[PDB]
Amino acid sequence: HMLSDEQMQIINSLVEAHHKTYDDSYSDFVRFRPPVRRLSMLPHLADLVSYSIQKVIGFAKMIPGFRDLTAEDQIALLKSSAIEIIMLRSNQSFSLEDMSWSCGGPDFKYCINDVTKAGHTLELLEPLVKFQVGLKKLKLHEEEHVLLMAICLLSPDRPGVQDHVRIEALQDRLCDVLQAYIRIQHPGGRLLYAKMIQKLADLRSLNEEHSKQYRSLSFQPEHSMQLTPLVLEVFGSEV
Amino acid sequence: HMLSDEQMQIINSLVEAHHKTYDDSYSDFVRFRPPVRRLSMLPHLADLVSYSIQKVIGFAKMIPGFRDLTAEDQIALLKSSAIEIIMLRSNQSFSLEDMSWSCGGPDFKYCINDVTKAGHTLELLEPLVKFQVGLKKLKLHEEEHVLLMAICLLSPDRPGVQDHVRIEALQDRLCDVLQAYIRIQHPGGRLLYAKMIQKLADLRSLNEEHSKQYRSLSFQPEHSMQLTPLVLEVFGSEV
């Protein structure tokens, strides 16, 4: 069998959205506070993440159905899922060869130790890299990569969400698209969909661990002052 | 006549404090978000000012008497006077030759138009440069420059101050030091002290105009998100 028009244009507008919000040249990185190698890397990685939050909002605004949600639910989904979308999108720059994120040149090549200099520990970073390796080993299509991020964005089991029926519905329609894509357009993808859903579960525990270490970071004023207003707002505990 | 020991060590510890918190090489500027020439210069000048706020706190902590004040009064004085201390200290990089602030190289040479690209207007910038020219034309000693900043810091007519008697006392003792310094150690300074006190009045109206344009800036989220936590806190209206 084959995909329907509606599933097709969902794929189209999603792939187009990722292209509009992800720069493979990483040319905007020179605009960040430069990297330094206590917590020397925090200003750069804070600028990097803040920039990424903005891009995630752009992507989300183009996910079919997201714009129709209430502003509250839009925020609640964005706040809870952000760091996971960041982790998901960051796979595009991750290299299996040197176990790092390569983003333009040697200044913007980020190894595990760089994130250590941002206030984070191996309790987050080793399952992080573990996650990145497994995800990269799936060799996802651009359609599958973009669907997965949209699946994750529209997860109904987030703190703060209200219309858990409408959000579960959008996510289910998105999941239908993915199942269908793998079956029809991905040879030897007999098991891929299951592996991808599992990757969402991994993100949840990655999210939790980051939220713990960030909460540590944000409670110390000498460190929280190195963050950005956007980062503080999105990862902050205000309702 | 001559200066007393106590007036002398007030001068000494003040000059030492300015040296510890002002870098004539401006080498930390490469750590800021780079300058760009809507509101392209805002990230750099926000990083610049935030950095400067930190340096002003360092200076203030070494002003004899400031540390003994309550934390509340310390904040209240710091919040209200900050931008004036910034304007005062920035005279060291101001050049009469090109009417600009030269801070290391051509990237960090700031003309009036650069600040325009930070969300500010000529209603602030032309009395600003007007102020800088007059101050530079005084050709202050390092002792007079450092005393003036400490005079300004300990002004008792600020919003929020409580112990206006103790703060007026410290400022008066500082003023005594200045009057004495000019008389004894500054030839042809017959009128300088009066001119300097007038420069404090100019700062008040400069402060007011900046506070208006900043309030405009801070109310727009797309602009306030480009500021720093420290800037937002110090120039913000919270009590």
Binding site: Q54, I57, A71, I75, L78, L230, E233 | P221
Partner: peptide
């Protein structure tokens, strides 16, 4: 959430 609200138009 002033920033987020603005960014979401």
């Amino acid at each position: 959430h002033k920033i987020l609200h603005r960014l979401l138009q």
